[PDB]
Amino acid sequence: RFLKVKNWETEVVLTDTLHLKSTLETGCTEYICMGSIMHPSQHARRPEDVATKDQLFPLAKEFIDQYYSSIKRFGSKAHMERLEEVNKEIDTTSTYQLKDTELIYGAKHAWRNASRCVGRIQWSKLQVFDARDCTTAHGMFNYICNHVKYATNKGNLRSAITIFPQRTDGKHDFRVWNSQLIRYAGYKQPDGSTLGDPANVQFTEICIQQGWKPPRGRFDVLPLLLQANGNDPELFQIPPELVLEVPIRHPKFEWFKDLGLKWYGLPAVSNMLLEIGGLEFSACPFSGWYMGTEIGVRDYCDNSRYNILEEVAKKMNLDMRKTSSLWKDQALVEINIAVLYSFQSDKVTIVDHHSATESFIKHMENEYRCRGGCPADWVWIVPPMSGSITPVFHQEMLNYRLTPSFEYQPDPWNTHVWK
Amino acid sequence: PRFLKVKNWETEVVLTDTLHLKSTLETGCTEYICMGSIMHPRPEDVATKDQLFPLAKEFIDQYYSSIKRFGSKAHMERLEEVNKEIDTTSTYQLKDTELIYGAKHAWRNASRCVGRIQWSKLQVFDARDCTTAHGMFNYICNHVKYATNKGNLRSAITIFPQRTDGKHDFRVWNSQLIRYAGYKQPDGSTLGDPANVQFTEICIQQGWKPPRGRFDVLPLLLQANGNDPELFQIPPELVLEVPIRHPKFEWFKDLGLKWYGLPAVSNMLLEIGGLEFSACPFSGWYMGTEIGVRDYCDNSRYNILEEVAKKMNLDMRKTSSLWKDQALVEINIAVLYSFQSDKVTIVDHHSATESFIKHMENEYRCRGGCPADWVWIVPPMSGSITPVFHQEMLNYRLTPSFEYQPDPWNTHVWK
Numbered sequence A: 001r002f003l004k005v006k007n008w009e010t011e012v013v014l015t016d017t018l019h020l021k022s023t024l025e026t027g028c029t030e031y032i033c034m035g036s037i038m039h040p041s042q043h044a045r046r047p048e049d050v051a052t053k054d055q056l057f058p059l060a061k062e063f064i065d066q067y068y069s070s071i072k073r074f075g076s077k078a079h080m081e082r083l084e085e086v087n088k089e090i091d092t093t094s095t096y097q098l099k100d101t102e103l104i105y106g107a108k109h110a111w112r113n114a115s116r117c118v119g120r121i122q123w124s125k126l127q128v129f130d131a132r133d134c135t136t137a138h139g140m141f142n143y144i145c146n147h148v149k150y151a152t153n154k155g156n157l158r159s160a161i162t163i164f165p166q167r168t169d170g171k172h173d174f175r176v177w178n179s180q181l182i183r184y185a186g187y188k189q190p191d192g193s194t195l196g197d198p199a200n201v202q203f204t205e206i207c208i209q210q211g212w213k214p215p216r217g218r219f220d221v222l223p224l225l226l227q228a229n230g231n232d233p234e235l236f237q238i239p240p241e242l243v244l245e246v247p248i249r250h251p252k253f254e255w256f257k258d259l260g261l262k263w264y265g266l267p268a269v270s271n272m273l274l275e276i277g278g279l280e281f282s283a284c285p286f287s288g289w290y291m292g293t294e295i296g297v298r299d300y301c302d303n304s305r306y307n308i309l310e311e312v313a314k315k316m317n318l319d320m321r322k323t324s325s326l327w328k329d330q331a332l333v334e335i336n337i338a339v340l341y342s343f344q345s346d347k348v349t350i351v352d353h354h355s356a357t358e359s360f361i362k363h364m365e366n367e368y369r370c371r372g373g374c375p376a377d378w379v380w381i382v383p384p385m386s387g388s389i390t391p392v393f394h395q396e397m398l399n400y401r402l403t404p405s406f407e408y409q410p411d412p413w414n415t416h417v418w419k
Numbered sequence B: 001p002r003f004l005k006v007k008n009w010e011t012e013v014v015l016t017d018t019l020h021l022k023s024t025l026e027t028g029c030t031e032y033i034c035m036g037s038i039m040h041p042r043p044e045d046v047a048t049k050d051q052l053f054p055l056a057k058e059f060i061d062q063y064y065s066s067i068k069r070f071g072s073k074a075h076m077e078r079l080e081e082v083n084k085e086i087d088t089t090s091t092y093q094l095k096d097t098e099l100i101y102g103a104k105h106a107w108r109n110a111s112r113c114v115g116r117i118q119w120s121k122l123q124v125f126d127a128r129d130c131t132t133a134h135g136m137f138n139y140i141c142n143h144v145k146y147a148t149n150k151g152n153l154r155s156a157i158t159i160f161p162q163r164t165d166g167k168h169d170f171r172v173w174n175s176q177l178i179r180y181a182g183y184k185q186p187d188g189s190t191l192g193d194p195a196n197v198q199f200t201e202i203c204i205q206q207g208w209k210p211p212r213g214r215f216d217v218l219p220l221l222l223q224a225n226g227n228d229p230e231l232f233q234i235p236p237e238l239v240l241e242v243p244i245r246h247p248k249f250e251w252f253k254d255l256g257l258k259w260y261g262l263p264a265v266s267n268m269l270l271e272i273g274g275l276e277f278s279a280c281p282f283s284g285w286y287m288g289t290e291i292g293v294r295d296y297c298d299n300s301r302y303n304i305l306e307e308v309a310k311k312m313n314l315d316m317r318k319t320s321s322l323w324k325d326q327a328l329v330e331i332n333i334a335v336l337y338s339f340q341s342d343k344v345t346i347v348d349h350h351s352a353t354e355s356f357i358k359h360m361e362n363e364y365r366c367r368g369g370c371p372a373d374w375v376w377i378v379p380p381m382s383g384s385i386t387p388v389f390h391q392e393m394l395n396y397r398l399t400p401s402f403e404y405q406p407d408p409w410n411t412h413v414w415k
């Protein structure tokens, strides 16, 4: 019918009708809630492979209808011609091509619909690099390098997405094999331990197994592994002058810099699929800027990531014999102060979790006021530290799936057949 | 389906949930929208005879299956006996064994409770023979004295007579048995606990003479058989309290903070086999963050971050200094150190979440699942450094269950 959400700190009640437009299953039912499952649903808008006409065209008509509605047409000459044009195109190529305006609209709205993103107040401010003319891995690398340079902007980070050719028959996919454009290698040591980033151990072995010479350090920027038109992937080294990095120091603990920690400034997600009117863009690296907790809480303090809590706590002279001393919690705060202080000192864009969550509450108010709603995944929006002293903790949220969207996709090495 | 799988993304352990097939009540989600973060998704509304028949049957069957006597002659006679009561009286009475089993399984089934590794160690106080508010007071005092146990806390529940026609409900009007008053001042400020202002006002109106301090234990407001509720002062020697000091900050004790040892929830409804026990106060012990993070640092609560940060000499001009986060940790260190030094049972969020993972895996082993509400199970601070953060969970509603119910002052017909 028409669902309300309340913020238990301010008592603001919001009334959602936008959820009436959602198409895909969430995974939940009236009897089971899947709100904490990472991939709860496999409901897709299109079938396994190259769809027939009655499969692709309805999705296309829906997107075109929606875009022309967005600009106060619908039924206009251009809209009706566009339907004819997409119709003939599917008839003659089993697919269709988005106009440049449609492509920008869909990317921005995929971000606007990303239930899990705390950063969406910026959604309409997004630079879109059309890369659909690309044909080879070298061209992909040229496009990605230009993306990184524009997005980094000497530290004043700018949001951007680069969109490579859409999927055609499933055998000609463009893929960035890296999960992010810039990540650190991880190495499996002989004494069982792990050097660098443990999350990236498998991808690092693929790179080494592809001819990459590992420097074998704690912060080795990985090479790019780029696949164009279903061909075997190719390795490229991002020119280091394009990889902005921030050494981590602490504003009171002088010894903190001696931990030898750094991180990169540009988070650039390169393994997701962008879905627009039944078209699948399997390579659409997008970047924005970090929330400090991403680095200082998850990257640094997860147990299967860098796991630096004991080292920081030891240097802090903390009681580490029992959990009740909250030594982990004390170190966790100091690490996150350091990450923030370091980025702001080098004038690299970063947002703390207090300001970011406040902005999202304000984004929520705007979206209900003009759009009748805002899909939001509480499990992902609430920051991984100090949850209840941020406003989103006390905010009820409705989660639902709107298109266009960003979707997960399989890692290509589970699917690729080499040649 | 027929199986469901949950994964822990930190350990990669995968558990297989079959128990969700037994759930019968709604979560509030639909196939196309998730309401996992909604907090809540008439008096005449008591079950008809026909509604009660299958609910009673399901519960009696469950009970006899639990004790490996399903299909037994005792099982078949109990079932027939329950039917006679429902036909003749429109309701039925649980055996003591069934009451104990049901109370324990409501706890086991509470998807939002992180302390369920203890579910089967629960002292059930059968108070179904109670008839007056003076009697409820007596029962509640004994509950408090037992549960508190000089600081060695023991979980317990006291169960008052079930609902009949909805016009003779037993209710504890208090939200917890021990809770601090709050007073709104003319200047708009608040003395005491801001969460309890409305209930403090109801108390004063009923004749409570308030000390108007910052930590006044509220009186009991007790309702028996649907009569007007009555006031009782819990004997102070039964209210165990812990003054909050810090292991390193000499100054912390000068904040004058204290809290009570015994969390005892008194406003929920226990549903067993279709019978509704509108008054069922239950108690365990605290996880430190309930006090240190929520009670003390919520802006709508005691809201002491700013005072603690000041004494800590933090830079409070910008959020990104993380002064709030820094002050929050120290407050929670104090709460834990204070309870431990006074030998009053308490559990930190790390110990508790790890025990819950162990409990959850055991439930999957022996029971085929464990409904769990991630939004509630993850602690309100340092979430991702606890193991439950990385634990996929399935949320579904099993009965017997603890339920929310309206505040009694929103429905009571004053006599």
Ligand code: HEM
Binding pocket: A107, A110, A111, A114, A116, A117, A118, A119, A120, A122, A126, A159, A160, A161, A286, A287, A288, A289, A290, A291, A294, A351, A356, A380, A406
């Ligand atoms: C501009 C600053 C931005 C900030 C501060 C931000 C913040 C975040 C954070 C902290 C997460 C959680 C990530 C994790 O825990 O793994 C997230 C998720 C996400 N963000 Fe944003 N984001 C920003 C921009 C963008 C842009 C430009 C896009 C795409 C155009 C985007 C799309 C997404 C998506 C799709 C997810 C969900 C990913 C998933 O489900 O794994 N974000 N965001």
Ligand code: HEM
Binding pocket: B103, B107, B110, B112, B113, B114, B115, B116, B118, B122, B155, B156, B157, B282, B283, B284, B285, B286, B287, B290, B347, B352, B376, B402
């Ligand atoms: C033995 C130690 C226990 C611990 C450490 C514990 C811990 C917790 C915590 C931290 C919460 C969340 C509280 C909040 O945020 O408001 C909770 C919720 C809950 N607990 Fe437990 N608990 C314990 C015992 C019990 C017992 C004995 C019962 C009942 C017999 C119980 C039933 C519940 C229920 C029903 C909820 C859900 C509350 C709601 O929906 O609002 N717990 N528990």
Ligand SMILES: N=C(Nc1ccc(CCNCc2cccc(NC(=N)c3ccco3)c2)cc1)c1ccco1
Binding pocket: A038, A267, A268, A269, A286, A287, A288, A289, A290, A291, A294, B009, B010
């Ligand atoms: N980690 C596992 N799986 C896994 C599951 C889900 C994910 C999603 C990761 N999205 C990373 C991500 C996504 C979105 C935003 C950011 N950040 C930003 N600010 C940003 C980037 C661009 C704009 O803004 C980071 C990643 C991995 C795992 C452990 C064991 C087995 O699998």
Ligand SMILES: N=C(Nc1ccc(CCNCc2cccc(NC(=N)c3ccco3)c2)cc1)c1ccco1
Binding pocket: A008, A009, B039, B195, B263, B264, B265, B282, B283, B284, B285, B286, B287, B290
């Ligand atoms: N206060 C509001 N709403 C609201 C607040 C709280 C709730 C649920 C609170 N359960 C309190 C609770 C419940 C269960 C356990 C504990 N703890 C224990 N350790 C314990 C007790 C017994 C055994 O163990 C505490 C529901 C609604 C609000 C905000 C704005 C307007 O209203």
Ligand SMILES: C[C@H](O)[C@H](O)[C@H]1CNc2nc(N)[nH]c(=O)c2N1
Binding pocket: A008, A393, A394, A395, A396, A397, B037, B038, B039, B375, B376, B377
């Ligand atoms: C809006 C949101 O559902 C609400 O703030 C929840 C979040 N998780 C919680 N978790 C616990 N343990 N206790 C709570 O009161 C809440 N409140």
Ligand SMILES: C[C@H](O)[C@H](O)[C@H]1CNc2nc(N)[nH]c(=O)c2N1
Binding pocket: A036, A037, A038, A379, A380, A381, B009, B389, B390, B391, B392, B393
């Ligand atoms: C099991 C749980 O869903 C998983 O650990 C989630 C929890 N919330 C998250 N929230 C964010 N922002 N990012 C994450 O990776 C996760 N992981």
Ligand SMILES: [Zn+2]
Binding pocket: A028, A032, A033, A034, A035, B029, B033, B034, B035, B036
């Ligand atoms: Zn759900």
